[PDB]
Amino acid sequence: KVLRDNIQGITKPAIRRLARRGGVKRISGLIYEETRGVLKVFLENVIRDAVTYTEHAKRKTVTAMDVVYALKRQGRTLYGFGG
Amino acid sequence: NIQGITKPAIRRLARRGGVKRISGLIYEETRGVLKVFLENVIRDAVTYTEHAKRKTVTAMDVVYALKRQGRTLYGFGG
Amino acid sequence: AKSRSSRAGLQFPVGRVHRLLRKGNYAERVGAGAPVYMAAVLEYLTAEILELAGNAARDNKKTRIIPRHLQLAIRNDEELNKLLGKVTIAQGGVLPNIQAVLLPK
Amino acid sequence: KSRSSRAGLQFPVGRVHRLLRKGNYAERVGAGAPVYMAAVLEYLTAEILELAGNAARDNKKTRIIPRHLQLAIRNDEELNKLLGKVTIAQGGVLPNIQAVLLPK
Amino acid sequence: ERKAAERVRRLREEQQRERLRQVSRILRKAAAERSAEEGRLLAESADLVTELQGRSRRREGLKRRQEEVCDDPEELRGKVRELASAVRNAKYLVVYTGAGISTAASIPDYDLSEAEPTLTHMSITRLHEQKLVQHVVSQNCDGLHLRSGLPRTAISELHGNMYIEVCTSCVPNREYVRVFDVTERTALHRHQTGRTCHKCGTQLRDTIVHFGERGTLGQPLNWEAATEAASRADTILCLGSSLKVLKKYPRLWCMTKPPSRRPKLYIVNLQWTPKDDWAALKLHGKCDDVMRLLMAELGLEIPAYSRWQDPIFSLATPLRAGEEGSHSRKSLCR
Amino acid sequence: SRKESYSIYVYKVLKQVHPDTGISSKAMGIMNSFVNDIFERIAGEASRLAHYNKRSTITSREIQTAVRLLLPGELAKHAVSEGTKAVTKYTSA
Amino acid sequence: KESYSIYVYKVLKQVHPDTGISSKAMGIMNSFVNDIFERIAGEASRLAHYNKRSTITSREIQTAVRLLLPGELAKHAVSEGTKAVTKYTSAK
Amino acid sequence: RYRPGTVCLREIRRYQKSTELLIRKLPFQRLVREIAQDFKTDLRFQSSAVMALQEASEAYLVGLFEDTNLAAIHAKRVTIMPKDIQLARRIRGER
Amino acid sequence: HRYRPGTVCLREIRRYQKSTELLIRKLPFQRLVREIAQDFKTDLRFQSSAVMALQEASEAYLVGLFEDTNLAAIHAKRVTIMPKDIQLARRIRGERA
DNA sequence: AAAAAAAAAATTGTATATATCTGACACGTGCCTGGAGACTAGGGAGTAATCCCCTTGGCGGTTAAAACGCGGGGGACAGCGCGTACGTGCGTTTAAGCGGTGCTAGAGCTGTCTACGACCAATTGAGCGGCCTCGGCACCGGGATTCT
DNA sequence: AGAATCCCGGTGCCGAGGCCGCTCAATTGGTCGTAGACAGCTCTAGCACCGCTTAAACGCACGTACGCGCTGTCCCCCGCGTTTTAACCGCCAAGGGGATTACTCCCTAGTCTCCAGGCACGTGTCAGATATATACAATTTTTTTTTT
């Protein structure tokens, strides 16, 4: 099975909830698609770095350690997942 | 002592940034921000200074200080 | 006293940090007093963070500290924010803040 | 008969070999790794100098200036991404005027 | 300032917190259970137990407000004699139907068709034929007041009469009556009767308004008519009202105009309300019994409700074809 | 195999500061990340500046300078003093 | 002091024989070459640390080149480096 | 019915006090699998990595969210518009 | 005659984006560098290279701040800069917590 | 007679007390591996002497740069009217999420054995310091084109 | 018509690329200790499926508060002129501190041996979830009273 039509998997109420955590009172009707695009580009960046870290070790399974190394490579060190 | 940066100089360096109009309350905040970044860089440089047992700070030490903040500068022995 | 940590009156290991220093590819030889300094500064940082974490814990009538509590502790300190305003904490959230212009008049 | 010559490359490799060994990077160094590092070095130098020369010829100049290399490093998106946080000596900025600031 | 200073003022904040929590703890337990030496901090903080007793007594007062309060029948009948004098002397007068009258008529306190006009509605109608009462505002949405024989202009309902439906299409609007209640067809956020006019041919809109939407038609129920009726009255009366529905809309009372300039207002209710203490004359009793006794001083008999005598059935237009199966509740029969 | 951590030592300092306070596992994870991160950071600038002045040895001085580098004013003033008294206590005996 | 001036000059003459260059721009070039040196070697070093290895080879640095550099540039660099190392190993 | 805005602030504080995870695991996991299969086919992922991606994406999006909130309030507005996010991303240093 | 307000502004924009010369006078800069540096310890000596490095680094960072503020201002539906734009820039870039 | 201010009540979240239980934290234990005690050697670092490079300092010219005033015009800002896009609540549909159940690709460790990298003496050339010579480019100026 | 900018020519002037000479560093060569490539065995976690209960997403409609356009105002920088001023250049003196070399002490690395501290594991018990059923300060809105 090949995966398609999944960027729409993040739903409008989810983005509303995220904006409320952001401290926003009003949401425009043209925000969701561009938030989707920003999420898509950042996800592609992080997955590319992580997957490269993955084949570097001659491994066929992605590791959360690879994810951590990538995320601090973009200068986004994350706490509580080891390292 | 901080007044040594004249208003025309600030106007010109705002021009180089592409600004057309300047308010009357800009100069003091520009002076403050330049003061704080200068004090950061000079702290880093002077610490690098007393580490290696010398009484005069060199330019390459400034290069070290600026490269620490991810502000690398070229053309000075870097 | 046999352990080096007890010799200097520190509560983090000296042998472990010294071994990490030697097996770290930082310098081919290492001094003797460096691990003591490392343990001391580690004491200071861990103690100061855990103190404010416990303060936050007793603020909400809770006897167990959670990374939310540490998030609260780290976001309300001026200097420690400059330490680690760069990092991200798991399930930490954000301190409440509403702009005064957003309030009803 | 130098290693740079038997490799076909230009930048030194034995120099790279020593500065890898004294670099405090590993207790041991591989053999062909500095050849790789030199090759990628010649690459990046080749395209940066290519675009710098294009900029210089675009200004009818036979010599290079930090202004030309600044223009070269700013016009292309990939090198901009690589040279993101880097501030260049005597480079300047790309001329840009925003649309609605222009007179109607 | 100094980190030591940070620690010390944190400590003084801590001692403030501990003293507040321990004064709270001393307050919580009763004085009788505790020892004599204990509670001296509570004893010197007599203001604390003072507002504690204040909280207890205000919750008790709220409970008294909710629970039904009775008055002595003889003082009630004397005050009703004064009420009879007041209702006789006034040339124009307004009476406000209440939720106590709703409970007497089985309408929920604040189906509908099966409900019949209560004896309080009988007495109000009798006052209307005697013309002592000129206008009436009804809390209840039943329309049982119309069944009682009230003139439609004389009675104003803020919720709306369930039997009556008014078309929103026409600018003057078209008024129809149906014996059966329509709440079964109608739902929240939708305002349509679903019954086409015999003449216009457009779907009617029920005069009742649900919760959460605004009625845009003044013909079914006229606000300024009620305000003018209140203004014209020499005195204002209310009976058997929990008042919350009438609390919702102030204009029908015309509470807006100053208490001095307005006609004097009196409210009678078995359950306590703010207008009860606002009223100069207060009477605690069942609304039906009070109205019967008021009729007794008036010397005029209470009417008896009859489906043949109920105006709504004749005022009801014939139902549209096929609408019988639409409504879940059967049509009323006179 | 065996895994190295700082659980016993940080738990000891928890007792030293707060004898009557508990702890959670995610808290242990986040503090372990904190201790690691600060350790490689400080050792990093120490190694850089040791390379910088052409010295092959690492001692208390370069790491004291590193502490005064990354740590703000009052925190650094406290850290240098505590480290000095600690090192003199260690070397005295 | 050591610098890469002559080698860069050879690169110029192999690409642009009829071109003259100043000294400042050469300083920028030297700083640039050193900078990519620390980036590439350092990330190779953390790669060697991560996989619990103690030997530095062509693999970690080639993965690093894939890592820091864009697609067309990355594939060009990896291809040239592989051909260069194969040429180096061909002759002994 | 409450006035417009009280519910807004209610949700604001309700989710500011909350610390949990705000995107359904299955759809975002499907998305990461789809976006990752373009680089090497027949990939296998573990749970720790996907929750790491959860947390990182949530942190970034929240951060850029208050950034755009500041940008919008600077624009004498209470409404947020796409120009706010384009500004925030341009001036943060990406793109 | 009198030029309309803006023509000279565009002219100076064009001339200053075609120039690379340092913009502020050097002696006041050396004065300020000395008079900020002396506070940490007394009797310091400086060389020209460090001073010019500080000069041009500061010039570049500040001009960067100004295109940042210019984008903020044009987004603000304005043609005039105000301090709140600089405050927003310091918010975004994160140097000020 | 109308507007403003204070008080009171009703909302509105906001915070809370408590009975049961449950799974996770804390404490006890064996042991085994890293840390500690002792001795040796050797190279790195601390200390003394020199110099000459460089930084600080002063002074006269002049000259572009800075400072101040003033008329004026475009820009900021407040207010008002109006259309609509989004908050909000309810009925309906859907898929996330939990619980087993099973399989297997795949990570991890163990053994070895050979290929590869470190170390050191010889040695030779490519790279670095000095001097040059001369041409590419800056400078002042005249003219060619371009918005206003 | 008009100032500002691009364009062409002439002249001077100091940096750039060559050339000479030498010295440390790259290269040969051999050798010995050692890391990982490879096979294989194993055990565990990710994948796939199924069934079900339910909480969330969606579609819709209604209202209303907000963004936006327009108009008026007033007001505050801009361009230009004129007086003021200190920046910069060039030159000259002097002393400190950076850098280099020589030398002798001593501190880390390394090795061996032995022991005790931490880790994996297991079990008890109690703090917090979880549901249930309630208080409660802030607030805010409406009414009533007072003042002009």
Author numbering:
A (entry chain B): 20 to 102
B (entry chain F): 25 to 102
C (entry chain G): 14 to 118
D (entry chain C): 15 to 118
E (entry chain K): 10 to 119, 139 to 362
F (entry chain H): 32 to 124
G (entry chain D): 34 to 125
H (entry chain A): 40 to 134
Study text:
We show that the SIRT7 N-terminus represents a unique, extended nucleosome-binding domain, reaching across the nucleosomal surface to the acidic patch. Contacting H3K36 versus H3K18 requires a change in binding pose, and results in structural changes in both SIRT7 and the nucleosome.
To evaluate how SIRT7 contacts its substrates at H3K18 and to compare target-lysine specific binding modes, we next reconstituted a SIRT7 complex with a H3K18DTU-modified nucleosome for analysis by cryo-EM. However, while the mechanism-based cross-link performed equally well as compared to the H3K36MTU, the SIRT7:H3K18DTU-nucleosome complex required further stabilization by gradient fixation in order to obtain density in the cryo-EM maps. This suggests that SIRT7 binding is more dynamic when bound to H3K18 than to H3K36. In concert with this reorientation of SIRT7, the linker DNA contacting the catalytic domain is bent inwards towards the face of the nucleosome by 6° relative to its position in the H3K36-bound structure. Moreover, R289 forms a closer interaction with the linker DNA region, whereas other residues contacting both linker DNA (K272, 275 and 276, and R290) and nucleosomal DNA (H217, R218, and R242), are positioned further away from the DNA backbone (>7 Å). In consequence, we did not model the H3 tail or the ADPr-DTU cross-link. In contrast, when targeting H3K18, SIRT7 has to partially disengage from the nucleosome to a more ‘open’ conformation, to allow the additional amino acids 19–35 of the H3 tail to loop under the bound enzyme to access the active site.
